[PDB]
């Protein structure tokens, strides 16, 4: 019974892609934010150095 | 009489069905808000940090 | 009943979620305003000194 | 769950590059102010000879 | 017949449900207004200070 | 009703902030302008005894 | 309210500062002219005595 | 609650900061007037000697 | 009829609530203008004692 | 003849029942337009307090 | 209506907030005036006697 | 013929509907411009008497 | 038709408002010129006195 | 129109206190010139009894 | 209005500074002179008497 | 054909809307850059008048 | 034959019914847009007037 | 079209606006100079009977 | 054939109508944008005459 | 094709008003500097009459 | 092009007025020195009939 | 043009004074003169008597 | 096949479009830039002038 | 055999009504875009214009 | 390519603005020297004359 | 078998239209970005150039 | 399995763009700093040599 | 038996005809995905480098 | 692949007109503080002169 | 990693650029004393030989 | 690299221009001297003679 | 370039103005010179007669 | 901490410039007094001589 | 506080300096007028011994 | 370091410049001087030779 029921595989499946592109998902942003802020506080050194 | 009804037999086994059915509604909607909301929340930060 | 609802769980995740992020703003906008006002308190020093 | 965070990961890149333009920061203005207030001085020289 | 009808039930069962991530959404933009002003009102001293 | 209102309390807390760092920019400022107004006087006096 | 404003506190002070390098400035002038006019007045003698 | 705000926190930092900005504007401005009106005095040396 | 349209009910509710929101908004940029404003005619001051 | 019709008696149940789900699907929407336009009104606060 | 307006209690505010530090302008620039030219008077006195 | 049309019936109640709503839109829409332009006045002031 | 916009109404609100705070603007701006020039003029005189 | 403008009724009043500070400039460099040219008539006195 | 100057104040305050400094300042060449041409009648003596 | 498109109707009714509401933005702007630059020339009075 | 068959009367009655319902739904859109746009474009005018 | 433009409408207003203020400016520094250098002229007056 | 389709007789009449459409949008948006951009002309006069 | 878009209209239209505001921007900096300058060219004419 | 442009007649203008003042400045040193020079003469006469 | 110049005005102002205090200037050096000499000529009256 | 696609011919008429718009990007902020910095270096021009 | 199918004769006439209704779809859209995109383009120019 | 973009149009228009108001400012520095140190060297003049 | 599929026709019909298209997309989105970016840069030369 | 993801595939060249764009963005912003701030050290100079 | 069911040949020949057209789903959607996101990533350069 | 990015040719175009914008950026600082910074000089020759 | 950041290398290019305007800073402002103070020194010798 | 930076090119644009006019404040002073201390000596002439 | 300074011209026009006052200055003392010893010579010859 | 700001190295090293040039500053005017009451001595012998 | 202000250690360090000076001031002048009325009172000898 | 400060190799040169001052200073003074006394001993020959 538990465990034999296809909607159980289809789900479990499912749940490991969303967790795999959830890690996609940070990762991307991750880079995004990284980048963007980092020139941010670039352009916060030439705000501060003037 | 009662409980000798293949339709209630039939009923119940949908309804236990649909009950794991919603566990995985809610299992996976958790997922995704969970890691949605978190990356909102984090992009949120960025303009705090702004 | 109370407490068995996946929502509550992921409101709660969220707000830890949250409640970290909002410690990265705080965190960050300290050390911004920090260097930021302290060049600037820098800068007032030469100007007193003129 | 500690430290397994993106964010906190992000969270850090960005601090650690808020801290080396900060450095640059100060290292910028510093030499400014160097500068110019010692051309000041220098200014402040000629007036105390005249 | 009031009170015995399914759909009645469902209904007060989404109004409580409704009523509880009502006081989730108030709760999470009182705790993300709270630190996005309270900094935003930090960067106010700031100005202030100049 | 009043006093139930999520948002009467953020704007409670959001106006103890606003209060709070008021106090600080006061304080610096007065910290500011005593230490430069303070140089300024003494300036004067070197003035005054010329 | 009256006695409350930090900027009367400051005030208060640069009144002190003030009124105190205005006894440097009387000071100073008068340890200036005592001399100055004192040799003045001893160049007077030798004019009287001629 | 109290001392626990992180623009508390940067508030002292930047009084420490002023504090001792303001030791180096008194600093300067001392070792300024003191050559400047020491020299002068010494002018007026010359002016009494004549 | 009129006033038993649940529309109704609830436009006047949000009617209600905008205005309360409506106190928090002058209520809160006028400590804001309050304190800003003040200080800056705090460094009026200094700039008339000048 | 009139009211005897079986087709009536369902008739108008139906209209009972759909009376009393209009009720509820007004109900549903003033508590959601309630909730969701009392928070954007909190965040137009937090935008005319800026 | 009038006299309702928060608007005009910030803007009296701001005005008794404005005399009181036009009375601290006046007030230390007449303490400054009445020194400098006190001491500048005291300078034509040793110019008359010579 | 005309008027007997149910649709009709229908269309016109929804046109009244329309109308009150809009009365809704208007009266809503109103007020918040009223004190969202009126701070800006406001904050107009502030910037003119700087 | 004319005068029964809402949009009219607003406008003319804004216009009464906007008039209010000219006059804000002006009455400050006054308090601060007649001060600050006032005092100019104050030290128009000492120097026309020297 | 004329009459009405604020900037009028300052630059009347700054126009009374210029007159004012005016008689004061006068007044003074009266009260110096009557001293000093009354003394340096009294030296003129002493040479021509010579 | 009229004697309500600070300016005022402190031209008073000067008129009485000056007026004592020039009773000083004949006090002064009333004492020089004095003695000056006291002795140069003397020297005068000395001619008649040859 | 032409003139009985309900289209029209609407579009002509937003023209004349969007006109009127044309007329209150340029009267808007008007009123607030006759004030702003109003006082931004007084302003300009009191340096040419420095 | 032709204007016989009860299909063309049917035919033509619903055809006389869409026509209505087509002027129901021109009149209904028309009255939305009317609103919708309307203040829309009040909208813009409060960004013209910014 | 020409002299149907608002912004001419304003630019005129400016335009008398700023002759007024012209005006006023030349006058206040008319009055400045006439005793300034009329003072001036008295001192030279003084230079000239020595 | 070719002409007595009544797909094609839709096709045209939608066509006409979609042209009629596309000259309301570019009507509307250029009136829009000719009194924004027409007043933030303006607002660049007043920066330019700044 | 050329010169039936409305782009080009609306271009063109902004292009006039530009041109207008240009002159409006260079008659009014004209008109500032001009009383501007003429002052300070006085204000040269009593440093060169000394 | 060339004249058509307001700073040339703005410059021109100027131009106007600095020899206008300028006449002004000879004027008023021809006279100072005129008097002053002439008294000087006459003090040089007094010198040779001495 | 020629005599709306305040420059003007003042500068015939001016000459009006100078010319005054030119003939204070003449008249008391004369008078000076007159007595110094006038005593000068009968010294030398008594050395031609001797 | 090549050409054929509706969608490459809808595409090149918006690329001329584009440019065409373009050309009336560069136009404007040419115009806007040079009536902007023109009137700058006339400002310049003042600068250098004094 | 072949051709003589009248599934055929139907297949082949509902693939010619087909390629027309193509070519009715993509020159509907073509003419939705071009206008769409076209005044986004000009909405774009108004951006770069800013 | 070279010479098509508008940006050096409006660079070299620019240029050219520059150098002509350069031409105005030395020409006018040059015409306040010259009277400035004309008079300065006629007040030389008068020295070396004593 | 492979590649006797009209799905397989059908994908491959569309990847060549996407490819298209996303040419079309690259190509549009370079053009908008160059001429925004390219006048940014421009505005930023003028921005260096102040 | 893992490799075998189209969405992995998609994720990584993403990643790739991402990096290259960050790249562009780096290079691009360190140009304009580089230019910007290196004449702002040129102006910097300008107050140094001042 | 296992194996000789048609419906088992039918199932598992769309078996593979899904897997087909899935491979053609994510073929397809990573070609979407891949340049929409590819130029967003472009527009976020664009950001970063301003 | 490498070059074959539009977003590459795009960022390359986008350096060229930077690169060149920057040649115009220096170029035009250079003229103003050649003028500028060359005129001073001059002034600095009329105080060496003096 | 270290060395690897572009905001490093641009840091380092302003630090040269800066040193480079440093050296002229310096250059300029020893020429200028050279010349001021060396015939401030002739001047002195002027005074000395009188 | 070295000699192609503009500010360069500035700098030694101005070093010339500042050597030109050394040139010329010492070519003025030694005009100014030649003549003063010339008359001076001639002055001693009279005194030697006498 | 050489002849083409404005300052060169400002330099020889300066030039020229002082030779000519130098002529006034030798002219003028030999003058005083010419009578004063003159005078100086006829009272020798009163001495030499004696 | 102490001795980690950049603050305090730039301090110490404008200690020392100044501390440097104070050193210049005594220097200079040691040598400019000996020299100058060298001569005033020697001076002072000639009228002991007399 | 009292003995803290840096301002008071200047100015005692000055008052020291000062007294040195005076002592200067007085030894000096004592060896002036002791050789030069020794001298005067040895001429003093001759008359007596004539 | 030392040795490396452009201000010592300013401070050197001025103090060469001043020591061939201080030459020229007493070169002047000594001729002076020589010729002086020597009359005014030739004149002390006459009177013992009376």
Same mark, same amino acid.
């Given at each position: =019974?538990? $465990? +034999? +029921?296809?909607?159980? =595989?289809? *789900?479990?499946? !499912?749940?490991?892609?969303?967790?795999? %592109?959830? $890690? %996609? /998902?940070? =990762?991307?942003? #991750? #880079? @995004? #934010?990284? /980048?963007? @802020? $980092? @020139?941010? !506080? *670039?352009?916060? *050194?030439?705000?501060? =150095?003037?």
């Amino acid at each position: =019974a538990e $465990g +034999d +029921d296809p909607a159980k =595989a289809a *789900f479990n499946s !499912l749940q490991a892609s969303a967790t795999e %592109y959830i $890690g %996609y /998902a940070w =990762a991307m942003v #991750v #880079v @995004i #934010v990284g /980048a963007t @802020i $980092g @020139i941010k !506080l *670039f352009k916060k *050194f030439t705000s501060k =150095a003037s």
